[PDB]
Amino acid sequence: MEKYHGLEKIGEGTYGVVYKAQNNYGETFALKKIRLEKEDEGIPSTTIREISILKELKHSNIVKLYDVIHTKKRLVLVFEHLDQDLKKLLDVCEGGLESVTAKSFLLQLLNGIAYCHDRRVLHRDLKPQNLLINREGELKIADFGLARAFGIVTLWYRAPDVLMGSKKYSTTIDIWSVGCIFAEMVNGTPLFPGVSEADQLMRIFRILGTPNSKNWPNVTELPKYDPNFTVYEPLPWESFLKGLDESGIDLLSKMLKLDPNQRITAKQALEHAYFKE
């Protein structure tokens, strides 16, 4: 356990319960007790190793992992504590964020991602709840790399190719989520709030158009691709986005390309004109 007191439950996180706590030095940390479906199974050394290496992620926009505590059918991660997150902030911001705030958060999000991508660390489950924010306006991404360790579900930020069964390692998956979060920051409301895998795809296609072999070569090789998908044409960007100037729309359009091979990278996004304004 490593000597923590005043364990206060502050949330249900993705893989388990998050507590705020203090060590015996007075300092505040977040403790994430990973929920073990099968207690008796144990955690293998490969898993511990793939979590422990995340301690090497040292970046101002990545939540710092301090410790991995494995004792007796219990696994707790000790992380830097931040008091706020983007989900809770958006929940009290009618209409979404002011454009200068969304840009600031987007820049920070992309910087964290770019850092991780350069180290071949993927997130795969980016969402507002894991973008933590401190009193100074600094955004820090939580849970990067945990998907490689650990694999009712929120499908809102999942890329179409992922929804259609793609299993490959790819950085592109995260950029799709960024695009969805960007739109949510500017609009207030989530862009594609699907209730099932099928409905999630329809929500995306109703806005951006149904894929076909011409706008997404090789889309037909995906295991859950469906040649009978309803065919929708793309809507004009300005019709479902509010509060975004032309550079902003352009950038967003590059993140929400359906074909992952044409989707902008994090580092490319960072070079976009939207950020020089």
Curated annotation (Swiss-Prot):
SUPFAM superfamilies: Protein kinase-like (PK-like) (SSF56112). The modification Phosphotyrosine is found at residue 15. CDD domains: STKc_CDK_like (cd07829). Pfam families: Pkinase. Its cofactor is Mg(2+). Its EC number is 2.7.11.22, 2.7.11.23. It catalyses: L-seryl-[protein] + ATP = O-phospho-L-seryl-[protein] + ADP + H(+); L-threonyl-[protein] + ATP = O-phospho-L-threonyl-[protein] + ADP + H(+); [DNA-directed RNA polymerase] + ATP = phospho-[DNA-directed RNA polymerase] + ADP + H(+). Changing residue 32 to R: Loss of catalytic activity. The keyword Kinase applies. Residues 4-275 form the Protein kinase domain. Gene3D superfamilies: Phosphorylase Kinase, domain 1, Transferase(Phosphotransferase) domain 1. ATP binds at residues 10-18, 32. One of its GO terms (biological process) is cell division. Activated by cyclin cyc-1 in vitro. Activated by cyclin cyc-3 in vitro. It comes from the Eukaryota. The active site is at residue 125. Serine/threonine-protein kinase. Involved in the control of the cell cycle. Required for entry into S-phase and mitosis. Probable component of the kinase complex that phosphorylates the repetitive C-terminus of RNA polymerase II. In schizonts, phosphorylates ORC1 resulting in its dissociation from DNA, relocalization to the cytoplasm and likely its degradation. PANTHER family: CELL DIVISION PROTEIN KINASE, CYCLIN-DEPENDENT KINASE 5. Belongs to the protein kinase superfamily. CMGC Ser/Thr protein kinase family. CDC2/CDKX subfamily. This is Cyclin-dependent kinase 2 homolog. It comes from Plasmodium falciparum (isolate K1 / Thailand). The gene is CRK2.
